[PDB]
Amino acid sequence: SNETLFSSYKMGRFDLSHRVVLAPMTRCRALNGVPNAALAEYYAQRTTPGGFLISEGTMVSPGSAGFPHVPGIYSDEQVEAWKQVVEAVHAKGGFIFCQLWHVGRASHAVYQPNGGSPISSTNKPISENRWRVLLPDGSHVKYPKPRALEASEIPRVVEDYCLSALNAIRAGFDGIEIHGAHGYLIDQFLKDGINDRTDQYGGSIANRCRFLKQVVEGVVSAIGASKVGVRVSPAIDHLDATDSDPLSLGLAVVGMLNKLQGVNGSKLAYLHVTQPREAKLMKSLRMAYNGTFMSSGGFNKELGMQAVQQGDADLVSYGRLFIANPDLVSRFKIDGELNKYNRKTFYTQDPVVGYTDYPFLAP
Ligand SMILES: Cc1cc2nc3c(=O)[nH]c(=O)nc-3n(C[C@H](O)[C@H](O)[C@H](O)COP(=O)(O)O)c2cc1C
Numbered sequence: 001s002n003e004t005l006f007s008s009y010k011m012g013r014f015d016l017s018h019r020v021v022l023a024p025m026t027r028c029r030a031l032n033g034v035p036n037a038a039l040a041e042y043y044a045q046r047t048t049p050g051g052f053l054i055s056e057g058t059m060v061s062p063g064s065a066g067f068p069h070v071p072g073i074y075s076d077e078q079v080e081a082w083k084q085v086v087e088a089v090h091a092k093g094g095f096i097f098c099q100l101w102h103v104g105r106a107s108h109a110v111y112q113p114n115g116g117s118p119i120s121s122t123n124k125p126i127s128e129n130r131w132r133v134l135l136p137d138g139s140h141v142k143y144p145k146p147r148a149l150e151a152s153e154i155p156r157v158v159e160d161y162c163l164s165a166l167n168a169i170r171a172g173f174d175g176i177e178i179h180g181a182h183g184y185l186i187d188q189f190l191k192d193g194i195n196d197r198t199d200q201y202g203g204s205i206a207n208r209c210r211f212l213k214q215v216v217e218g219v220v221s222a223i224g225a226s227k228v229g230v231r232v233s234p235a236i237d238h239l240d241a242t243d244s245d246p247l248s249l250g251l252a253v254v255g256m257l258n259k260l261q262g263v264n265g266s267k268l269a270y271l272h273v274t275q276p277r278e279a280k281l282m283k284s285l286r287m288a289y290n291g292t293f294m295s296s297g298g299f300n301k302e303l304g305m306q307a308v309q310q311g312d313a314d315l316v317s318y319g320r321l322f323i324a325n326p327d328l329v330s331r332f333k334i335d336g337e338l339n340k341y342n343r344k345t346f347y348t349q350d351p352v353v354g355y356t357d358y359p360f361l362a363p
């Protein structure tokens with residue numbers, strides 16, 4: 001009860017100076033899928049010594065994008081271009097994980113090779129009321145009808161995750177995070193409100209987890225458990241990703257990861273859980289997971305401070321506030337003022353405006 005957001009922490013290999021984490025955040029500045037100086041600049045600004053960072057969602061294969069100008073890690077060109085961003089982070093003594101991202105059905109023909117259909121667990125489109133895919137021209141259109149995968153096809157998509165993880169390390173990354181949240185590919189298998197499968201990848205809760213299990217297994221096999229994080233969001237309806245019982249789902253995922261750590265012999269870097277914005281559900285998964293717990297969603301300083309003090313979380317990741325405040329860790333420390341975030345420049349392509357030009361705190 002004497003631990004705070006500013007207490008040091010040992011994350012297996014990595015000795016952290018504090019608990020404030022940069023949440024993964026799509027910003028769409030990686031023009032044409034390739035990272036650049038602007039990304040290096042933006043992440044560097046946000047780096048503190050012993051500070052932990054999570055990169056924006058990063059493509060694992062052609063077709064895995066549902067956003068314009070998001071970066072990839074499947075090609076050599078991408079690997080080489082990422083090096084500057086990581087080196088920049090390492091220079092300032094921070095740690096960085098590449099989030100491995102497949103959007104599944106949350107895509108468009110535009111982002112698909114040969115203009116194909118996005119792949120998912122189901123053939124059902126995302127409903128057309130609340131949700132629209134954003135296109136390179138800035139317009140918003142309806143999500144198309146996806147193609148459900150053959151069972152035989154899945155081991156290949158898992159191999160895409162392996163290569164991406166192997167590239168990430170080769171590019172200098174300290175590790176990777178599996179994006180299994182927010183209604184993207186993995187979540188489309190996890191949630192029974194999407195996964196209408198007949199086979200071993202659907203039905204029972206154990207069956208809905210089988211996809212993630214394999215993805216986590218293959219990646220851990222490739223680069224070691226200690227360099228792997230997993231992000232899930234059991235209670236988030238984004239893109240029609242509902243479950244009949246989110247608490248049982250979360251606990252089935254938590255349970256899966258525990259029972260995997262015996263099979264491997266080593267612990268994962270962390271489990272990353274996002275809240276929408278009961279609170280029993282979070283505390284429940286925490287007690288249940290044997291390892292580091294990074295909690296996310298709607299946090300400020302006081303909430304983040306009390307989460308650590310009470311043992312609800314080891315680490316707390318910040319999204320919206322970290323965009324507006326490159327030196328957020330310092331601002332929290334001295335209880336300083338916070339810059340407000342501008343929504344309009346979240347997903348614009350400018351290297352500077354709304355991206356790196358958020359001012360540091362004055363001396
Ligand atoms: C502009 C923006 C982009 C985001 N992109 C991602 C992403 O690529 N991958 C991911 O797992 N979460 C993404 N998120 C969700 C954040 O990781 C985080 O969970 C969310 O911002 C809620 O936390 P907060 O209240 O501190 O902002 C994004 C959020 C925002 C606002």
Ligand SMILES: CCCCC[C@H](O)/C=C/[C@H]1C=CC(=O)[C@H]1CCCCCCC(=O)O
Pocket residue numbers: 026182236237238275276277343346
């Ligand atoms: C001005 C707001 C634009 C919408 C941006 C929104 O935060 C969506 C972000 C998506 C992009 C990548 C992701 O991984 C998604 C984040 C999921 C946010 C879910 C909302 C949580 C809640 O229910 O409070």
